[PDB]
Symmetry: C5
Subunit: 311 residues, 5 copies
C-alpha cells in the first residue's frame, strides 16, 4: 500500500542505524571507498498494530512487498547499493524493525595537503524524499550505530564511526528531503614512509653536497647531474606511493624544494668553476667552503618553515 | 495502456529536468564521466484526470506498470542508465509528475589543446522516439534543472549545469526523434602544474645552459646529454598527468620545443669544440658568449609565440 | 509461441539494420571496440494479422513476450549484447517492425603493420540459426543502415558504416545459419606522431652522430652510450603510443633500425680509437670523415627502403 | 514458510561444509582472493518428515522456494556470493541436505613482513543471524570440508583447507549471530626470487665496491653514482614483484640497507679524495684498503642481524 | 519434473559437444582465457517420447522449464557461464537435443618455462553431479566438437580443439561425478621477439665488450656501467612482454646470464686497471686480449648449454 497516516499532523520519523561489517578498497585517486554494512530502519505504522494474547506470540514478521517501507537512498554512492533484506519485525504497538545488509562504493572527498600525516573524515549521507501524503524525517538510533572491531583499511588507523544526530532537512525539486551524515574517521599509519621515501631521497641529495669538497668540474658535474637523474629515477620508483593532487601537498613541497636545491648546487658548481677559470681561486674556495654549511642549514631551515606552514 | 490521445492534432510535450547529485570518474583518456542525478519527467494524460471532490485526495500515486510512461533514453551513454523510480504523482487534470534517480557513464568528447588552461563542455543528450499514435516532443523545466552545491570533479571548477531549451527535432529510421542538450561546464583548476611540471622541467633545461660558461668538451657533453636524460626521465615521471592526445597540445608544444633546445645546445657544444680544435678559439668564444643570451631570449620569445598561437 | 508457418516451402526473411548511435573504447591490445546502436528487425508473421476496422487501430504494439521474435545473436561479441526493446509494431498484413537499442563489446582483428598510417575494417557479424519448422534467412534494409554524424573514435577518421547485403548462409551442427557482415571503416589520424615520437627520437640519434667531429674517446663513449640510454628512456616514454604486436610493424622497424645505428656508431667510435692508439691516425681520420656523410645517407636510404617495403 | 519449531527449547544446528573447487586472483595489494566452491548445508525440519513406505520414495527433492532454508551469508566478501543451488534433498526424519556452488571475492588481511618467505592464513567467515522464533547455530561437518587436488595459486604452496569447528556465537543489534572460521593456509614458493631480485641487485652493489681498488676520483664518482642509478632503475624493474606496504618488510629492509651502503661508499670515495688532495695519501690508502674488507664484512654481518630479527 | 527413469539399472548418458565460436582475452598473468561457444547436450527421456502420427509432427520444441535438463557445470570457470538456450528438440523416442550459446572465463594453468617457444594446452572441464534417482555419465559426440575457422588468439597458432572421449568418473561429497576434458592446443608465434627483445639486448651487451680494446679505465667504467644501465632500462622497456613467473624461464635464464656477464666484464675492467697501476702491464694486456675471445665464446657456449638444458 501507501505511507502510514499521522496521529495528528506530524511528519514520519524513520530511526536509522549503520553498523560497519567490512571496509575495503579506499581509492586515494578516485576519492572512493567500499563499504559492507547493516542498515537498520525503524518507523511507526498503526495499520500494522496488533493484540498479543490473541495472536499467539508478541512479534510478527513481514516480507518487503507485504508492507510499506520508506525509500531510503544514499547521496554519495556511485551506483545504488547492493542490498539484501535480512529481517522485518513488527512489535504489537505497530513499530517496524527493518534490517538489510548492503555493500556500496561511497564517494567522499579527500584532503592530501598533510600527506603522509593526514587524517580523513569519510562521509556516508542517508536521504529520504517526503511524499505527497506526509513528510518523512530521518533520526539516529545510537544503539544501532557501530562497527566490527576488526574493520581495517591497510595504511590507516580507523578512529571512529559516528553519526551527526541532527538531520539536514531541506527542500529539493519542490519537496522536503531529510539528510543524515554518518562519519568514518581515519588517520594515516604510514611508517615505512621514512625508510621508503624520505631517507633514500635525502641520501641522494646529500651525495650531491659532496661537490663542495671537490674542485674537479668534471667530477662535480657528474655528482650534481647524475644525482639529479637518480632523484628523478627515485621519484618514478616512489610515484605510486604519492597523492597525484591538483594542489600542493606537504610531501610535494619537500620534493619541489629538493629540485630547487639541485638547481642551486649546479649554479654553485658552475660559479666555482668560472671563478677558478677566471683566475679568482680565493673566491671560488670561499663560496665552496660556505656552501658546505649554507646548503644543509638553508635546507634544514626551509623544511622547518614548510612543516610550520603545513602544521 | 498505450500513449495519451491528442486534444486536436498536437504532439505530446514531455517536460524534462536533470538535477546533478554527484559527479565523479572524469576519465580524460576514455572521454567519459560518471554522473548520479535525478531525472524528472512531466506530461499530460487526460485518461488519468480525476475529480478531487469524489476522490477526496488531491494527488494520486501510481506504480510505473499501472500507467503509460514515455520511453526516455540518453544518446551518449555507454550502457543504459541504472534507474530507480523515486515517485509518480498525478494531479486532477491528468498531469504526471515522474521522478527517478539514475547513474550513468556519459561519453562526451574532450579538447586538450589548451591543457592545463582548458575548459570543457560536457554533454548529456536526452532523447525520445515518437510513436505511431502521436509524436513526442521534449521540453525543459528550468525549475527542475540544477546541481547539488557539493558536486565536485577533482582538478576542475564546476562552472554551470544548464540545458539548451530548444530541442533538436529530426527524423530517424522513418520516425520523429526529439533531442535535448544538457551542458556541464567545467574549467581546469591545476595550480600545482607550475611546481609539479613546468618549474622542474625548466631547471633541467637551465642546467644544460651552464655549458655556455664551460670550455671542457667532456664536461659539456655530460651537461647536455645527462640533462637530456634527466628531462626524458622527468617526462616519464609526469607522463600520467599529461593527456594522451592524437593532436598537438599547448603543454605538448612546450615539451617539443624543449627537445629542440637540447638538440640546438648539442650543436653549439659541438661547434664550439670543433672551432677550438680547428685553432679558431675567438669564434668558439664569441658563439658561446652569444649563446648565454641567445638561448634564454629565443626560448622566452618562442614561448610568447606559442602562448599567442594557443590563446 | 513458435515460428510463423510458410505459405509454400520458402524460408523466413528477417530484414536487418544497424544504426550506430555511438562508438567508444577501441582497445588496440584487446582488438575490441564498444558500440551503442539500434538494431532494427522486420519479418512477416501472418498469425498476427488484424482488421484495422474491428481493432480500431491501424498498427498494433506488442510486448516481446507476447509474440514470436527471431533469435538474432552477434558472432564476434565478448558477452551477449545489452538490449532494450524500443518498439514492436505490427501492421495488418502481419508485418512486424522490431527495434531495440543495444550496447556490445565487439572482437574484430586489427592489423598494425602500417602504424600510424594504418586503416582498419571493424566487423559486426549478425547471425540467425534456422529452426526445424522453417529456415530463417537474414537480409539488409539499407534505409535502416547508418550512423549518427557525431560518431567518433579519438585518433581515427570514421570512413563508412556499411553492410555486405549478401548473407553467408551455411550449415553448422546439422542446421542452417544465415550470417551478415556489417563493416565500420576507420583510418588513423595521428598528427602529433611526428612531434611526439619521430622528431625527438631522431634528435637523440643525431646527437650520437656528433661523435664524428670528435677525437676524444671518453667524450665519444659518453655521446654514443648516453644517447643510447636517452633513446631507451624515450621509448619507455612513448611505449604507450606504440602498439604491442607479435609481428613487425613499420614504426617498429624504424625503432629496430635506430638500435642497429647505435651499435654501428659504437663500432666506428671503437675502430677510430683503436686505429689512433695503433698509430694509424690517417685511417681513423678518414673513417670518421666518411661516417659524417655515410651515417645520414645510409639512414635516409634504409628509411626509404622501409617505407617502400611497408607501402 | 517460516523456521522449523524446536522439540524443547534448543537452537537450530546448521551443519556447514565448504569444498574448494577453484582458487584464483590472489591480489596482494587489495588483500583479496577469488574462490569457487561448494557450500553444503544440513539441518532437521520435522515439518518435512515423511514415512518412506507410505510415500513410496526414500528421498524427496525440493525447490529452494518450496522449503525453509537458513539465511547463510559470508562476513568478509566484497559483494554477495554468486550462488547456484545444485541440490536439495530430504530424508524421512526431516533432515535437509542442501548444496550450492558459489563464487566469491574474499577480503582477508595479509602480512608481508617475511616476504618472500611469508605464509598466509586466508579466512572465509560463515555467518547466520538468529530469528524471533528460534536461535540458529552453525556447525562443521568435516566430511564435507575439503579442496580439489588441482587447486592452485601461482607462486604459492596450498598447505591446508580447514575450519575452526567451534563457532563464534555472539550478540549483535539485539540478536544472536553464529560465526564460522574457514582457513586456507598458503606459503610462498618464490625460488626465482634469488636470480630475479637479489643476485642482480647484489652484483650492482658489488660493482660499487670496485671503487676500493681505484684512486681516480672521477672513475669512483662514476662507479658509485652510476651503480646507485642502476640500483634505482633495477628496483623500478622489480617493483611489480614487491608489494605496497605501510610497514617495513624483510626484503624492504635489505633494499633500505643497500641504499645506506651506496651513501657510505660515497662518503669513503669523498674522504679518500679529500685526504689525497690534502696531501695525506697514507690515510687515504689505509681507509680504501680497510673498506675492501669492511664493506663486505659489515654488509654480511648486517644481513645476518636482519634475517635474525625477521626470523 | 525429476530425472528420466532407467530401462534397466543403467546410468544416464549425456552426449556433450563444444563448438568454439570465439576465443579471446588470453591473460598470461591470470592464467585465464575467455571463450564464446556452443554447448550441445543429448540424452534419452522416455517420458517425452511420442508417435509422430497421432501427436501431429515429427519433432517438438520445449522451454527449459517444461522438461528436465541435466545440470552441466564447468569445473575451471571463475563465475558460472553466461548461457542462452538456443534450442531444445525432442525426437519420437524421447531423445532430447539441447543447444545453448555460452561465454565463460576459463582458468587453465600455463607453463612459461619455454617462452617464447612455448606451447599450451588450454582445458575446459565439463562436469555432472549424479542424483538420488539415477547416476549421470558424460559422453563425447565428436560430430558436435569443433571450432570456427576465424578463431584467433593474437600471438598464437591455434593448433586443435579436441576432447578426451573417456570421462573421469569419481566420487565426491558422497555422490558420483562424471568429468570431461576439452583441450585447446595453442603454440606461440612471437616472430618480432628477435628484433624486439633479443637483438637490442645483445647489441647493448656487445657494446660492453668494446672495453676489451681500451686501456682507459674511465672510458671502460663508462662502457660497462652505462651499458648495464641501458640493459636495465631496456628490460624495463620489455618488462611487459616477458612472463612474471615464480619459476625460472628460458628467456629469464638468458637475461640472468646477461647480468652475470656485466659483473664479470666489471671484474676484468677492474683487474686490468689494478695490474696496470701495480706495474704489471704485460698481464693486464694478456687478460684483455684473452677476454676479446673468451667473452663471446663463453657466452655462445653457455647459451647452447641453456638452449639444450631447456629443449
Amino acid at each position: 500500500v501507501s505511507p502510514p497516516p499521522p496521529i495528528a499532523d506530524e511528519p514520519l520519523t524513520v530511526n536509522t542505524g549503520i553498523y560497519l561489517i567490512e571496509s575495503y578498497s579506499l581509492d586515494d585517486c578516485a576519492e572512493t571507498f567500499k563499504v559492507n554494512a547493516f542498515l537498520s530502519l525503524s518507523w511507526k505504522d498503526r495499520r500494522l498494530a496488533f493484540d498479543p494474547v490473541r495472536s499467539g506470540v508478541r512479534v510478527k514478521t513481514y516480507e518487503p512487498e507485504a508492507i510499506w517501507i520508506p525509500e531510503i537512498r544514499f547521496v554519495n554512492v556511485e551506483n545504488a547499493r547492493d542490498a539484501d533484506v535480512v529481517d522485518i519485525s513488527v512489535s504489537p504497538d505497530g513499530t517496524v524493525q527493518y534490517l538489510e545488509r548492503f555493500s556500496a562504493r561511497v564517494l567522499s572527498p579527500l584532503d592530501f595537503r598533510r600527506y603522509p600525516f593526514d587524517s580523513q573524515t569519510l562521509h556516508i549521507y542517508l536521504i529520504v524524499r517526503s511524499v505527497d501524503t506526509r513528510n518523512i524525517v530521518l533520526a539516529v538510533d545510537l544503539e544501532k550505530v557501530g562497527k566490527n572491531d576488526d574493520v581495517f583499511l591497510t595504511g590507516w588507523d580507523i578512529e571512529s564511526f559516528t553519526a551527526v544526530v541532527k538531520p539536514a532537512n531541506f527542500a529539493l525539486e519542490d519537496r522536503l528531503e531529510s539528510k543524515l551524515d554518518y562519519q568514518l574517521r581515519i588517520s594515516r599509519q604510514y611508517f615505512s614512509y621514512i625508510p621508503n621515501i624520505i631517507l633514500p631521497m635525502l641520501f641522494i641529495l646529500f651525495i650531491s653536497w659532496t661537490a663542495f669538497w671537490s674542485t674537479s668540474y668534471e667530477a662535480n658535474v657528474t655528482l650534481v647531474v647524475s644525482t639529479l637523474i637518480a632523484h628523478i629515477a627515485f621519484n618514478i620508483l616512489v610515484e605510486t606511493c604519492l597523492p597525484k593532487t591538483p594542489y600542493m601537498t606537504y610531501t610535494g613541497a619537500i620534493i619541489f624544494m629538493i629540485y630547487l636545491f639541485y638547481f642551486v648546487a649546479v649554479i654553485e658548481v658552475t660559479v666555482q668553476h668560472y671563478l677558478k677559470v677566471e683566475s679568482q681561486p680565493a673566491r671560488a674556495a670561499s663560496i665552496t667552503r660556505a656552501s658546505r654549511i649554507a646548503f644543509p642549514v638553508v635546507f634544514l631551515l626551509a623544511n622547518i618553515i614548510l612543516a610550520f606552514l603545513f602544521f
